[PDB]
Amino acid sequence: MENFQKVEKIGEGTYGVVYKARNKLTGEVVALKKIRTEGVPSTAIREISLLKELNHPNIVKLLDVIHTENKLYLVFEFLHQDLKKFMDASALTGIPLPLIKSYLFQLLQGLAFCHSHRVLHRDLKPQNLLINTEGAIKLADFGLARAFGVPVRTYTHEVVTLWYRAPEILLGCKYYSTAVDIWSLGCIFAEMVTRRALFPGDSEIDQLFRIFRTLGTPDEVVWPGVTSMPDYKPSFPKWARQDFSKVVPPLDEDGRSLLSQMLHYDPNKRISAKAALAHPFFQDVTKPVPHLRL
Numbered sequence: 503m504e505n506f507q508k509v510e511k512i513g514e515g516t517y518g519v520v521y522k523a524r525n526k527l528t529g530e531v532v533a534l535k536k537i538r539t540e541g542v543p544s545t546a547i548r549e550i551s552l553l554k555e556l557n558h559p560n561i562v563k564l565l566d567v568i569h570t571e572n573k574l575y576l577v578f579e580f581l582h583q584d585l586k587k588f589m590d591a592s593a594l595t596g597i598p599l600p601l602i603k604s605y606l607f608q609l610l611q612g613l614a615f616c617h618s619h620r621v622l623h624r625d626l627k628p629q630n631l632l633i634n635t636e637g638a639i640k641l642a643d644f645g646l647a648r649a650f651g652v653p654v655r656t657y658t659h660e661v662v663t664l665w666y667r668a669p670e671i672l673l674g675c676k677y678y679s680t681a682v683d684i685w686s687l688g689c690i691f692a693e694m695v696t697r698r699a700l701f702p703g704d705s706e707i708d709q710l711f712r713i714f715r716t717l718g719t720p721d722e723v724v725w726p727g728v729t730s731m732p733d734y735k736p737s738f739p740k741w742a743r744q745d746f747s748k749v750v751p752p753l754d755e756d757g758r759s760l761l762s763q764m765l766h767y768d769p770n771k772r773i774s775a776k777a778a779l780a781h782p783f784f785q786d787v788t789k790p791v792p793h794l795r796l
């Protein structure tokens with residue numbers, strides 16, 4: 503890519519390095535992801551290229567896809583910073599509730615849009631939610647999981663986080679439904695509110711058992727078919743479910759009700775992004791501007 507002057511390194515993604523770069527012809531400032539090879543299913547190129555038409559205000563725009571010289575470049579819209587950095591920067595005072603509400607509301611709109619188009623993310627995390635100084639938040643890397651899969655480690659060998667992974671994935675389900683993204687967003691919602699990860703697992707079983715310790719070990723009553731999942735073991739310890747009042751204090755009842763529906767074990771019962779947007783929690787939603795120093 504000689505059509506871009508690198509401005510600086512932005513970060514390291516799951517698949518490749520990312521640079522802030524300026525289009526030397528349009529003057530456009532973008533986030534350029536470079537992914538580094540023999541096989542490579544052409545289906546991946548086709549699949550990713552289709553994402554160029556998945557445009558929404560709450561979805562980071564994919565400007566172009568370029569497969570050349572044993573590399574795959576994804577040119578993305580450039581945004582100020584990610585939610586992880588904002589949360590860490592807001593750790594002492596916490597992100598105000600009105601902004602947390604606004605962010606969740608926008609993220610759900612982004613999800614409703616993509617899910618209405620049968621595109622799921624599958625690996626949502628604070629690191630891929632980007633914000634600007636005007637109060638907007640957008641989801642990034644949407645659809646890359648389907649094309650490439652989610653590896654155990656990134657291209658730099660960094661451990662891919664399990665914290666936001668839905669239970670059906672941990673239990674070995676073959677087919678992922680849009681519910682997996684609602685679960686991840688619910689975990690992110692809890693983290694913004696409490697300023698601590700909800701389920702900070704450090705292995706698949708630690709992740710699964712942390713989920714069980716809070717929400718209760720699932721059974722056929724709350725989740726039909728769970729005992730027949732590939733990685734379910736009758737030997738899982740049986741933990742009692744905790745009250746959300748203890749889980750995400752001091753969130754109000756509307757928020758706890760919404761979070762609880764976002765964390766239902768049964769994917770078929772977990773609230774949809776579309777239904778979540780109509781939840782009473784959003785009755786007084788606004789669009790505050792975040793405090794972004796530099």
Ligand SMILES: CCC(C)(C)[C@@H]1CCc2[nH]nc(C(=O)NN)c2C1
Pocket residue numbers: 512513514515516520533535562578579580581582583584629630631632642643
């Ligand atoms: C999804 C997580 C990665 C791959 C790093 C984003 C892709 C698109 C993108 N656009 N802006 C940024 C940024 O970091 N700005 N400070 C990123 C980074």
